[PDB]
Design a protein around this ligand. Sequence first.
Ligand SMILES: *[C@@H]1O[C@H](CO)[C@@H](O)[C@H](O)[C@H]1NC(C)=O
Ligand SMILES: *[C@@H]1O[C@H](CO)[C@@H](O)[C@H](O)[C@H]1NC(C)=O
Lengths: 214, 288, 222
Amino acid sequence: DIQMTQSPSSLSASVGDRVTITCRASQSISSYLNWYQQKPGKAPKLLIYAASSLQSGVPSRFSGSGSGTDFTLTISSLQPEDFATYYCQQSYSTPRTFGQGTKVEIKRTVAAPSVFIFPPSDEQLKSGTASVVCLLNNFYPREAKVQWKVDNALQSGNSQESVTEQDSKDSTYSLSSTLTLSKADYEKHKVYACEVTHQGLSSPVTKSFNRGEC
Amino acid sequence: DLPDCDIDKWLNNFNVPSPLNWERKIFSNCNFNLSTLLRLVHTDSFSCNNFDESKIYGSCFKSIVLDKFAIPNSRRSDLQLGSSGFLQSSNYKIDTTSSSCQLYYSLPAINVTINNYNPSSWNRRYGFNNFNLSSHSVVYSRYCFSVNNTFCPCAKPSFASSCKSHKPPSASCPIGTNYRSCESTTVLDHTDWCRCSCLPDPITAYDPRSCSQKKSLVGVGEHCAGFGVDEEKCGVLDGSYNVSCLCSTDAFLGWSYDTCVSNNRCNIFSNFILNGINSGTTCSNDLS
Amino acid sequence: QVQLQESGPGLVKPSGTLSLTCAVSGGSISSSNWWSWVRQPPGKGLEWIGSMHYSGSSHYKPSLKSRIAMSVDTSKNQFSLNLNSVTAADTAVYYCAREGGSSGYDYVYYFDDWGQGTTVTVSSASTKGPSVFPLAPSSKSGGTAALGCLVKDYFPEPVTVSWNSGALTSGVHTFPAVLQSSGLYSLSSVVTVPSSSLGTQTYICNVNHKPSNTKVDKKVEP
Ligand SMILES: *[C@@H]1O[C@H](CO)[C@@H](O)[C@H](O)[C@H]1NC(C)=O
Ligand SMILES: *[C@@H]1O[C@H](CO)[C@@H](O)[C@H](O)[C@H]1NC(C)=O
């Protein structure tokens, strides 16, 4: 097999920067080299084929060069929608082989999260479980801490969280944290709170509700 | 007491090769007049690259090397210096590093006979026959393929006889050559679907590294290494070791032809390579 | 204008057979294109597994040769994948793609017109559709409120969520699912809207879980 090795494996750049990604084949493959872009939750998309041919409809800020073993993908002026993993791929031989991928992260200014807390629905309660959701919306950088509190008891378990990938328009992240209790446990406590620490906030922020209030 | 180079006599020879079998002649130790040469051949254009044309007059050279061939009408623009078209990719590369001149001329069509010949010994070994074309048809290659001296395009009869589906044609390969590589594959409604190399064909080969026919641009001073062959058209179905491996006429791919004739004259090209200016005895008498 | 669409069951039992089909529109399967399958294990890169031409010629990932077979159906303009004796090593998103050649001398093959992919999970566990719960906007905030849907307790991946049948896309974040200790997935989808519109605008999340044949709309009200 022809091994494809990309450099770097990840990088961080600002909007308007020139981004350069290289790829090396373990043996000569002439110009039988293609580049793909894969955005979060989407299938790969062809950018460059035959080492330097730009696919129709792809912006001209993308370009490829090279022949033999060493190839280069260039993004002349990085845009937010270019957040993606990029892959090289050879078609000189079988099996077809891909490079390992290069993640392009977008550096931007700090943005504080907007924080929201959601009580369980009456519908879920009827099923015997209560999920409480804390949402941290549109923040940067990724590092954030969510601390759940139930009548000021600091939770260490009973929660799971998920984070989106950088937004294709504003390059921010969002985070969803779910605290899960039994309905029996949920109805024994009054104040449900999530406390958020993030470098964009002037102070750690707490969103809370009192069970039943309205 | 040195003889005339007689360059015009060679350029005006009525047996004119095509780009595929371009003819070189080396001139030396002789006298020539460029002025007379450009008159005695019906010159359309003479110009030089990496060289001052006006400096040929009155100069001596170690040798002067001419490479000539008729021009297929549709491919004349392929002869622009640096062109990636068919003529220079796959028939005759005009060397841009030498001191050279390019001559475009013509001969009355009624006398010209195009000599077409496939220079590839491996093509001819596996059955490529003389061309059977009109006397002003000019053959050119579109793709050239090189092979090792062990090349044979036919699947092995004993392998083919094991194929239940998609049996390749087969034949004995010459002593000292290797049979075409083949594998039994599984497809969703066949368990012995044999798949050999260079498919669908060498020009569109899915796996170029596994195809023994290697795409080969002509280098300086080279002839086309050979037309690619569709290996599915070499040998015969159920062919045994008593059949010699040959490829049918339609197996040879990636070549074309066009007439050289316009306004009742056949258009011809010759390259000139000027070797060793200010030395030797290939001398212009234009100033004498 | 070539468009591809994968189809086939997302859940396969261990040692069972994975069977996928790819339907081709906008172009003929009987052409110089080859047709390809490329898979992507969770958190991993791309791995080609096979390609086939309508003549029947094919190439497969060699480590899969004893388990894999493809077909090209010229009468239905479809091609298919069969992978026998699957294990958790075969859990992945499987993409179909067109593999065509460039117009240069080299005739370079490349992948194009990729399908959206189908998520395959190799598991003995049974399919389970989700419950869909509203994440209600706050009685309140500033000019922006958040609302959403909690898509709870389903198996296997994936689910799709839209808002107002696709008319609402701006400000939507659908999060990666988390695997709960029960072995079921749970996912949230949220959207930020003008708080001034909470009394006047209707917000419905549309949830589809194909493995369980679940289709749910949920109105999210303050
Ligand atoms: C070249 O031209 C000169 C001047 O007319 C003449 O003396 C000489 O013989 C010519 N040489 C040829 C025709 O080879
Ligand atoms: C052709 O010969 C070269 C050495 O000149 C060798 O490396 C190569 O593998 C040969 N190819 C085949 C198909 O035998």
